[PDB]
Amino acid sequence: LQFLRDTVFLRYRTRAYRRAAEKWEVAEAVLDVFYKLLKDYAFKPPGFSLMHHLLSPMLELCLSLMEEGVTQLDTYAPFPGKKHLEKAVAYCFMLLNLTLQKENRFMDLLRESHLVTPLEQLLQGINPRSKKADNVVNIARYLCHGNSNAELAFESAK
Amino acid sequence: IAADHKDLIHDVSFDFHGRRMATCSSDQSVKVWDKSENGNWHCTASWKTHSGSVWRVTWAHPEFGQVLASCSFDRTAAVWEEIVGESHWVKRTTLVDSRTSVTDVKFAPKHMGLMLATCSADGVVRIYEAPDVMNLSQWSLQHEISCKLSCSCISWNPSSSRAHSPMIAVGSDDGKVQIYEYNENTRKYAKAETLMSVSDPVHDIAFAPNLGRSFHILAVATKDVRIFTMKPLRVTKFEIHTVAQFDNHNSQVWRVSWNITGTVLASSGDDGTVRLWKANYMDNWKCIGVLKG
Amino acid sequence: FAAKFVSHKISRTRWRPVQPDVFATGSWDNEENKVCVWATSDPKQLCDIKHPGDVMDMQFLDKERIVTGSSTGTVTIFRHHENNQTLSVNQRWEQAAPCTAIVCSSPEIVSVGERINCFRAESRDVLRTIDDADSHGVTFLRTTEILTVNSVGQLKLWDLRKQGNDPTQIFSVTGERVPLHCVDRHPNQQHVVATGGQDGMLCIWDVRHGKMPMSLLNAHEAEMWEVHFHPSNPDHLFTCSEDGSLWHWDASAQLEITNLLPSSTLSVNSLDVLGLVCGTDAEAIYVTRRLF
Amino acid sequence: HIGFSWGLYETLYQKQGNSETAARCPFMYLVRSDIYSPVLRKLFNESHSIFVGLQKSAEEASGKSRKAQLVQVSRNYRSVLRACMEEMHTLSESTRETAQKYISQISILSAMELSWNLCEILFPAGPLLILLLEWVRLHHEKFWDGVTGYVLQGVLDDLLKKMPMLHTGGTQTFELKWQHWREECERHLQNGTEAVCRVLLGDEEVLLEKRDLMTWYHFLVSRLLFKHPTVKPTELHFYAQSSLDMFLAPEPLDNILLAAFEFDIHQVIKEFSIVSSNWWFVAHLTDLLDHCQLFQAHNLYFGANMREFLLLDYASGLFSHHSLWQLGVDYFDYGREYLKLHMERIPTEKKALKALRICEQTEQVRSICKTMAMQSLCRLGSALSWSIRAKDAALISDRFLKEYCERGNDLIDNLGSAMRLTFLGKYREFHRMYSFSEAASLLLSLMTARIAPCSFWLTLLLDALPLLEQKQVIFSAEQTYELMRCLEDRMAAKIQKQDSSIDNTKVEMLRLALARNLA
């Protein structure tokens, strides 16, 4: 799990540098992996560590994706790119929503386990980060509203 | 650390960097010291240079290589080159020409090339050149001139050439001073002038680095210290003035030495005191301070 | 950019393996050659290494170990036991002439001279030795290939993987004007490489795309010093020159190069920046720790 | 007996001594440097940095040209110096469990900071007095003094308040109104016929008593603050400090202060010399004074000469810290040849950088570089490469001899270096190996010059002719005869079958030429 996630963020910059079509696909694969991780969500401590990993650079990456989406609405289509890009956007939307309901129960439990302190910091530091920084996601939502293509709009409103 | 010489040490000399020291004694051996980066002088090598006592030593300019010249009562001068691979120093050549015991040997300034002078009981100053830099064994005899008989010391003008002409001071016996220059294309040494008022035996003489000064300075340690100012001006083209005399040693001044810049003079004597000197704004000398032992 | 006088002309600086917060430093050119670990961030001279021998190679051999190469081409490494504040000198080799740069191929600490002595992970015997005289470029283009760059700035891909003692390839400028001071090899792809011209130029390189001189420049003043690059933003980087100078060439930006650093001082030590220094050709004392 | 040698070392020839006490036994003597200490390095380094900053700022400002900015810029530099002094003070007590050293140095630094403050004030008087009081502070009746001291630097109780009001009514005024205000307060005090109330009345006797109990400088500050805030005549104040200080009775420091009050500056310089520190800092101060020497003074012109002497003294002081040496050279411009010579004497990358800097700003340095390359050669290849490169930058013949020897006994490196006649010939030989222009170039290289193996080169040429068939050599056969004659001459100065074979090979080329002629 560590190897793939590390590769994927690096590749996304790597994907962008070479071949827009092939970078996008890698990003879509990463989004799929994230979705799988969400579905999946000693052992409890490992889960807490994973939650901590999920909650600053990773948060920024989602923001970068949102910025790409804001760029995206204006130009391209590119449906195959759009599906993968669209799918990635949907995954980003869903993970925060799916994660948040899970996260509040999850984070408190992690804190209880800590009675670990660093992971708790994620509860503290992670919470501060979440508010954002709101604008970039919001712009993407506005673009989705302008598009009126459906979907994306639900995840944006939720 | 004890020199490691059984008999008395005649001379000590620094290399160009000031990191290395050479010593010679009457035990017939030359020792070379390394100043380690850890600050202790350690001897690099010691070897039996000559059959008879070694009075003087000198280091050539580091452009030519690691060369030390030595001088003995055996009537020879030897040139040595340091071998990095080492027995540390090898004889490049021997100078047999001096018919008598030699008092001193000095390399000339670097601009001139490998050139050295020597002075002996024969009282004949000899200059040797290496005409090929590549052949460090190829030492030709450039010149021979006559002096008088007894004490001797030599000291080249260290002035860089292009700016100045070569000349050399010879101090034998005395209070009498003898000075020599080099001619245009006669290619012979002439007696431009003499240093007068020399007192007792001239134990030592040194020419000072003329860095940033038009005039030249030479100091003699007689059994009095004197400083002379030479000025060329323009047949004849020389003048001397006597800057100062100093007797606060109250005794023989054995060694006179200059700074690298020529800023500081030093003097030592039988009082067992070493005096450092500065030039005033007036160009008079003042004793900065005295070390004792 | 909080400066700090060490009163010690610095030769090395590492954002240590452990952001750029654990500073360590190696101070050459002193009467008992120096290096300090945990200094300073705040005095924190936990391992101000009393040490004979100077710093040619230098590596954080773990987050609790430190590798280095010593002045005469000797070797020097301890294990930075930061808990109990002592250590144990791991590696001490005699005659590996100094070394001219430092490379890595984990964990065989490869390097180059100005002869190659491949020590490695616990390889206290000198295993590989392709003793080829070099007339300072050293890296791992792929394990365990390398490219020796002589002081004609003359790069040549050799190896230690297969047998042999020649090089396999060679990178070269038309005129070989500068000497071997500072080349580049990209973390974006280990077959991507550049260099900095000691006139103030770049010298960008293409491995696959021919072998041409891709991009020179004319921007800096002095010899090529070293380059701060972001350890995760490959593109973000800024340029420098051998007075210790630094021109911010905003390369994640497009030529946006200005008078960057707290400038006009003497030279800078050695480079590691993540989240810092870009050490000059002459390695004097300087500091700033605000690298975000 | 004393033998002294500059590196510095002192040794003793066998003698009775002198003394020797307790004992002297040919003990190694280390003689050297005024400059010392680990922390000393920080302070010296800090001073050098400050000097560099001073050089950096003023020249740039001048480039800007005349402005008040210059008036304020000078004040800023003084403030920076004060900050440096504060840092030095901080360093000291930071000395930990330990001995006693540099405490006097820190006291001297504080005195120098006070002097710099005075100089800035000279370059307003009431503010200066307040600042002086503050500096002195940094270096019941007591409670009343505390209440007053702070104010001056910016029924009984009721009587005291009234006295304070009276004191206030004097500072506000017209100095003529203050004169009358003090008199009335004195009259009120007389009517009163409690000590605190009298102090509140002031006007102005007690302050002198307080000074007697103490300090004269403090008394003077009090006078500037509450009596009349004009500072023009210091004979009376001087007597008070002089007499009050005596009553109070560091003495040397007081004397230095008195000299400063006299205005020096030669006396102040003498005092600094007696202290002996700071030397470089003192020289910098002298330079600043020379820069300031604005007001039409012949002494100042002499003053300028004194300032020029100070820079030379600073240069003499500098010893081996490379940045400091560079700073000294910069100061000198505003030594060059000795610096490079000194570097050569020191005798690698850093040295090369220094040489480059000198070039940017020489022959001796080049010679030193040549000597280092030779030492490296003594590396057996890279030393020649480095030394050869140095020669190119400005031995070359020696390099050619080495390269030619190596090519007879690497090739790619040689080609790169070449990119001279011998090298060209080697290139031609390489071209021939690759497989006529190359062979021609090799022969032209031979006609220009000859080589000792030379025979091998001739054999290679013969092989090339065989490959070619030697149609146009014609000259070469004539050329070959000359070479044979040269060989004979060499033999006279100092394989026969092999020599015959070469002649036979030559004949073949001639035959080929004849065939070409027939064609």
Short mmCIF file of all heavy atoms in Angstrom, two decimals, chain B residues 1-2 12 14 16-18 62-63 84 268 272 274 293, chain D residues 2 4-7 18 26 28 345-347 367 371 378, unseen atoms left out:
data_model
loop_
_atom_site.label_atom_id
_atom_site.label_comp_id
_atom_site.label_asym_id
_atom_site.label_seq_id
_atom_site.Cartn_x
_atom_site.Cartn_y
_atom_site.Cartn_z
N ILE B 1 61.13 20.89 19.79
CA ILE B 1 61.81 19.60 19.78
C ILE B 1 63.28 19.76 19.41
O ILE B 1 63.62 20.43 18.43
CB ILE B 1 61.16 18.62 18.79
N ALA B 2 64.16 19.15 20.21
CA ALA B 2 65.60 19.23 19.97
C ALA B 2 65.92 19.00 18.50
O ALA B 2 65.47 18.02 17.90
CB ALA B 2 66.33 18.22 20.84
N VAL B 12 69.39 28.09 10.18
CA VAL B 12 68.02 27.66 10.09
C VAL B 12 67.44 28.47 8.95
O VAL B 12 67.68 29.67 8.82
CB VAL B 12 67.15 27.87 11.35
N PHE B 14 63.65 28.96 6.50
CA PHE B 14 62.27 28.62 6.18
C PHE B 14 62.18 28.43 4.68
O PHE B 14 62.93 29.03 3.92
CB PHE B 14 61.27 29.74 6.58
N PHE B 16 59.54 28.76 1.16
CA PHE B 16 58.66 29.82 0.69
C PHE B 16 57.36 29.96 1.47
O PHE B 16 56.94 31.07 1.81
CB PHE B 16 58.30 29.50 -0.79
N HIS B 17 56.67 28.84 1.75
CA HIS B 17 55.41 28.83 2.47
C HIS B 17 55.58 29.21 3.94
O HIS B 17 54.69 29.80 4.55
CB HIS B 17 54.71 27.45 2.38
N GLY B 18 56.72 28.82 4.55
CA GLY B 18 57.07 29.04 5.95
C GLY B 18 56.68 27.86 6.79
O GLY B 18 56.92 27.81 8.00
N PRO B 62 59.67 27.74 -5.08
CA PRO B 62 58.90 26.51 -5.23
C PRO B 62 58.47 26.21 -6.67
O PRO B 62 58.05 25.09 -6.91
CB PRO B 62 57.66 26.72 -4.33
N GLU B 63 58.55 27.17 -7.63
CA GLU B 63 58.29 26.94 -9.06
C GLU B 63 59.27 25.95 -9.67
O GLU B 63 58.88 25.05 -10.42
CB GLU B 63 58.36 28.25 -9.90
N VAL B 84 59.36 12.74 -3.28
CA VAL B 84 58.10 12.45 -2.59
C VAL B 84 57.95 10.99 -2.22
O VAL B 84 57.38 10.63 -1.19
CB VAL B 84 56.89 12.82 -3.48
N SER B 268 69.29 39.82 16.61
CA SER B 268 69.57 38.99 17.78
C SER B 268 71.00 39.20 18.17
O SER B 268 71.81 39.58 17.34
CB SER B 268 69.36 37.45 17.56
N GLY B 272 71.17 37.94 24.29
CA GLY B 272 70.25 36.80 24.26
C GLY B 272 68.85 37.27 24.01
O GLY B 272 67.86 36.61 24.28
N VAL B 274 66.13 39.22 21.26
CA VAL B 274 65.75 39.35 19.87
C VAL B 274 64.87 40.57 19.81
O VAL B 274 63.89 40.67 20.53
CB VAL B 274 64.95 38.16 19.34
N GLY B 293 65.58 35.22 26.19
CA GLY B 293 65.74 33.80 26.40
C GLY B 293 67.01 33.61 27.15
O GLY B 293 67.87 34.49 27.10
N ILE D 2 70.63 33.20 21.61
CA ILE D 2 69.31 33.17 21.02
C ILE D 2 69.46 33.13 19.51
O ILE D 2 70.13 33.96 18.90
CB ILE D 2 68.48 34.37 21.48
N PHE D 4 66.80 33.11 16.27
CA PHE D 4 65.42 33.35 15.92
C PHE D 4 65.26 33.19 14.42
O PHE D 4 66.05 33.72 13.64
CB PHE D 4 65.02 34.78 16.37
N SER D 5 64.22 32.46 13.97
CA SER D 5 63.93 32.29 12.56
C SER D 5 62.46 32.54 12.30
O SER D 5 61.58 31.97 12.93
CB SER D 5 64.29 30.87 12.04
N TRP D 6 62.16 33.44 11.33
CA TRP D 6 60.81 33.66 10.85
C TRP D 6 60.31 32.48 10.04
O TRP D 6 60.95 32.02 9.10
CB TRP D 6 60.65 34.95 10.00
N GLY D 7 59.12 31.95 10.39
CA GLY D 7 58.47 30.93 9.58
C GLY D 7 57.68 31.53 8.44
O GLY D 7 57.56 32.74 8.33
N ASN D 18 71.57 32.96 30.88
CA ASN D 18 70.47 33.00 29.91
C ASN D 18 69.49 31.82 29.90
O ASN D 18 69.07 31.39 28.82
CB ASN D 18 71.02 33.23 28.50
N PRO D 26 67.62 23.50 25.63
CA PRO D 26 67.39 23.44 24.19
C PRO D 26 65.90 23.22 23.95
O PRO D 26 65.53 22.51 23.02
CB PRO D 26 68.19 22.21 23.76
N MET D 28 62.19 23.65 22.72
CA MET D 28 61.62 24.19 21.51
C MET D 28 60.87 25.44 21.92
O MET D 28 60.14 25.45 22.91
CB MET D 28 60.67 23.19 20.85
N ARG D 345 53.09 31.17 -0.75
CA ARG D 345 53.93 30.65 0.32
C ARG D 345 53.17 29.60 1.12
O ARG D 345 53.73 28.57 1.51
CB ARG D 345 54.39 31.79 1.24
N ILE D 346 51.90 29.87 1.37
CA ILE D 346 51.04 28.94 2.10
C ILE D 346 50.90 27.63 1.32
O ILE D 346 50.92 26.55 1.90
CB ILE D 346 49.65 29.53 2.36
N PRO D 347 50.75 27.75 0.01
CA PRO D 347 50.60 26.57 -0.86
C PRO D 347 49.64 25.55 -0.26
O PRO D 347 49.43 24.50 -0.87
CB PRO D 347 52.02 25.99 -0.90
N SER D 367 53.24 31.39 -10.38
CA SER D 367 54.41 30.58 -10.09
C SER D 367 54.09 29.56 -9.01
O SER D 367 54.51 28.40 -9.09
CB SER D 367 55.58 31.46 -9.66
N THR D 371 54.19 25.51 -9.17
CA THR D 371 54.92 24.70 -8.20
C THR D 371 54.04 23.60 -7.61
O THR D 371 54.51 22.50 -7.33
CB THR D 371 55.47 25.57 -7.05
N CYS D 378 54.99 15.02 -9.06
CA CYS D 378 55.94 14.25 -8.27
C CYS D 378 55.23 13.18 -7.45
O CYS D 378 55.71 12.06 -7.33
CB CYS D 378 56.74 15.18 -7.35
#
